[PDB]
Design a protein around this ligand. Structure first.
Ligand SMILES: *[C@@H]1O[C@H](CO)[C@@H](O)[C@H](O)[C@H]1NC(C)=O
Lengths: 108, 504, 49
């Protein structure tokens, strides 16, 4: 994610850059599965409405979570309870080969 | 023998060493220092694994103390190579799928590859000892291709797989050689009757998330057929994005425009490049779904075309799972005549062997003389040569059983055969009609000691690649002047076999 | 009124609802005075209530 945190008033919502590369030193061509969630200490809550199915372009990619979509999910719309909650992102990317598959995550 | 211009599989030094870690080394810094620096240069060898090798070190001098280092990166690769992608926990005696990805990082040069899945008696493959399984393919520069291979783990433990790919009008070859774990099930409890005479004589002193119905059907009007799939989820609420991995019967491709027609389809999407991929080696397809239902059958179907003509065709494969979870997947294999698309093998209590090699020793050759006839009968391999009469016949899906009536023991071998005895010979269903075999006919037959199914006295017989069979008519069916030449060589084969016996 | 009868019920599963309530009642209040019959008077009064 562009900035390490989530800014509550960032109208953009959140722009995310996906870098995917082979171990030997070459870039990957494919398609991605992006899912997010929230963690409250040891308590994690999954965010089902946000999953986006998204292409991967010459070892580079951009994904955008528009602020409109973001806010429709939330349970209690705005409160102080929300602070102290962190976000985690699980990525599942499949090659054009259809064969190899990688689970990735940004947490905290 | 079409083309002479490829590197022989027999000379394809595969990639062998794939440690997940190594060089646990410990080396000492004896060099005369300059600048206060002893410098060490350890000439080493580069493992047969293509990855950047990260190097981590620690200098323990007793005077200055410990010291971690800046990790060192050695970037390893070849222009063109393979990597093979397998599962881990496979189950012995269950047909599975693997995928082999050849990458090509040549910038402007396309490539034509002949690649063989290499034969292994631990696996039921399509590759017999003598009948190679070589697939020919073409690669766009700076692109890689996914090749499926469905197999049966016949044995347990650390099994290695090898595939050697060689190229034409160019230089390199490569080979992957990679092990994993095979294991057993142990149930053998499928709808047993109370006493089915399963026991021997001498002993003693799974798709849980998914509904998946796949059937490949034919077309009305080279050859094109229909692929049909029929899927569902088993739960309380409908499920999230599900994925399909679909792979092509050897030499197959979908209908490019019906593919396009389906992608605009509701709840579905296939990106453009795997959708406008080329007809040249379009072989593996991945289709992602928005959601899948728990309430009823939502099927799909589309066309497949035959790019290259080969008589025998790897089953297609279809693997479906929720976007999040691969391990609770469900895999089906298809084949139009093979029900559920499974290779023919031969099974007893916990053992199986692969029954997929040529039906019998090849017939119709110009040469049918006594000279070659005897030569294949004077070989040591021939354990038994019998002459019986097709008495009974059990036909079935799996195999087709011919009950043979041995009256004379021409040459017993490692067999204890009594006179006027009834014994069971098998032939796979794929072969049945090619044999043009009818009951009530005499047959003079022979095989090997290795080609005996079971243990004594509850045994059976198997007709293999090198088994020889030939019908024997009656006395009233050889008096024809047309049928002279056959019955001539039958009489002289017999007598000179009988009088002389075997030479040795 | 049918929607708002079961408010504080479908707030967790569907957070769209409060919008449909508000703008429907807005359409009421800006355009409630200009009615003639009492039936429409009565019901729309209650929903603004
Ligand atoms: C169970 O029976 C079915 C036929 O009814 C057969 O297809 C399958 O191979 C059997 N499974 C085992 C583990 O024997």
């Amino acid at each position: 994610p562009t900035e390490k945190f989530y800014y509550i008033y960032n109208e953009k919502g959140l722009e995310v850059t996906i870098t995917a590369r082979f171990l030997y030193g070459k870039k990957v061509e494919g398609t991605a599965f992006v899912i997010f969630g929230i963690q409250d200490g040891e308590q994690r809550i999954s965010l089902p409405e946000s999953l986006k199915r998204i292409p991967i372009e010459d070892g580079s990619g951009e994904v955008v979570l528009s602020r409109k979509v973001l806010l429709d999910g939330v349970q209690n719309p705005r409160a102080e309870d929300l602070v102290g909650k962190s976000l985690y992102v699980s990525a599942t990317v499949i090659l054009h080969s259809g064969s190899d598959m990688v689970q990735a995550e940004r947490s905290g | 023998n079409l083309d002479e211009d490829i590197i022989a599989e027999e000379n394809i030094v595969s990639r062998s060493e794939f440690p997940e870690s190594w060089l646990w080394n410990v080396e000492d810094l004896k060099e005369p220092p300059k600048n206060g620096i002893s410098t060490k240069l350890m000439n080493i060898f580069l493992k047969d694994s293509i990855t950047t090798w990260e190097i981590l070190a620690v200098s323990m001098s007793d005077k200055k103390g410990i010291c971690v280092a800046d990790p060192f990166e050695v970037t390893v690769m070849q222009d063109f190579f393979i990597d093979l992608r397998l599962p881990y926990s496979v189950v012995r005696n269950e047909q599975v799928e693997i995928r082999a990805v050849l990458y090509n990082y040549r910038q402007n040069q396309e490539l034509k590859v002949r690649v063989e899945l290499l034969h292994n008696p631990a696996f039921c493959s399509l590759a017999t000892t003598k009948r190679r399984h070589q697939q020919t393919v073409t690669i766009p520069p700076k692109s890689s291709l996914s090749v499926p291979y469905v197999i049966v783990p016949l044995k347990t433990g650390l099994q290695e797989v090898e595939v050697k790919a060689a190229v034409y009008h160019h230089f390199i070859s490569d080979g992957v050689r990679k092990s994993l774990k095979v294991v057993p099930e142990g149930i053998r409890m499928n709808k047993t009757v109370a006493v089915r005479t399963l026991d021997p004589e001498r002993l003693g002193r799974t798709c849980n998330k998914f509904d998946l119905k796949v059937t490949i059907k034919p077309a009305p009007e080279k050859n094109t057929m229909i692929l049909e799939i029929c899927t569902r989820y088993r739960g309380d609420q409908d499920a999230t994005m599900s994925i399909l991995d679909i792979s092509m019967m050897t030499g197959f491709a979908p209908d490019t425009d019906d593919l396009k027609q389906l992608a605009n389809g509701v709840d579905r999407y296939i990106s453009k490049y795997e959708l406008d991929k080329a007809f040249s080696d379009r072989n593996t397809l991945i289709i992602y779904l928005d959601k899948v239902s728990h309430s009823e059958d939502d099927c799909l179907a589309f066309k497949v075309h035959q790019y290259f003509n080969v008589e025998l065709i790897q089953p297609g494969a279809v693997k479906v799972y929720a976007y999040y979870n691969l391990e609770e997947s469900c895999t089906r294999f298809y084949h139009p005549e093979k029900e559920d698309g499974k290779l023919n093998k031969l099974c007893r209590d916990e053992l199986c062997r692969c029954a997929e090699e040529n039906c019998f020793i090849q017939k119709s050759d110009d040469k049918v003389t006594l000279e070659e006839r005897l030569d294949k009968a004077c070989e040591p391999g021939v354990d038994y040569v019998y002459k019986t009469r097709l008495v009974k016949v059990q036909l079935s899906n799996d195999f087709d059983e011919y009950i043979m009536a041995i009256e004379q023991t021409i040459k017993s071998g490692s067999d204890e055969v009594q006179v006027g005895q009834q014994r069971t010979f098998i032939s796979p269903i794929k072969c049945r009609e090619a044999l043009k075999l009818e009951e009530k006919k005499h047959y003079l037959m022979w095989g090997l000691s290795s080609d005996f199914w079971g243990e004594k006295p509850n045994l059976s017989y198997i007709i293999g690649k090198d088994t020889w069979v030939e019908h024997w008519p009656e006395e009233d069916e050889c008096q024809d002047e047309e049928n002279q030449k056959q019955c001539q060589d039958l009489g002289a084969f017999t007598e000179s076999m009988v009088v002389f016996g075997c030479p040795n | 009124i049918s929607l708002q009868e079961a408010k504080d019920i479908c707030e967790e599963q569907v957070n769209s609802l409060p919008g449909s309530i508000t703008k429907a009642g807005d359409f009421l209040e800006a355009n409630y005075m200009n009615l003639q019959r009492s039936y429409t008077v009565a019901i729309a009064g209650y929903a603004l209530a």
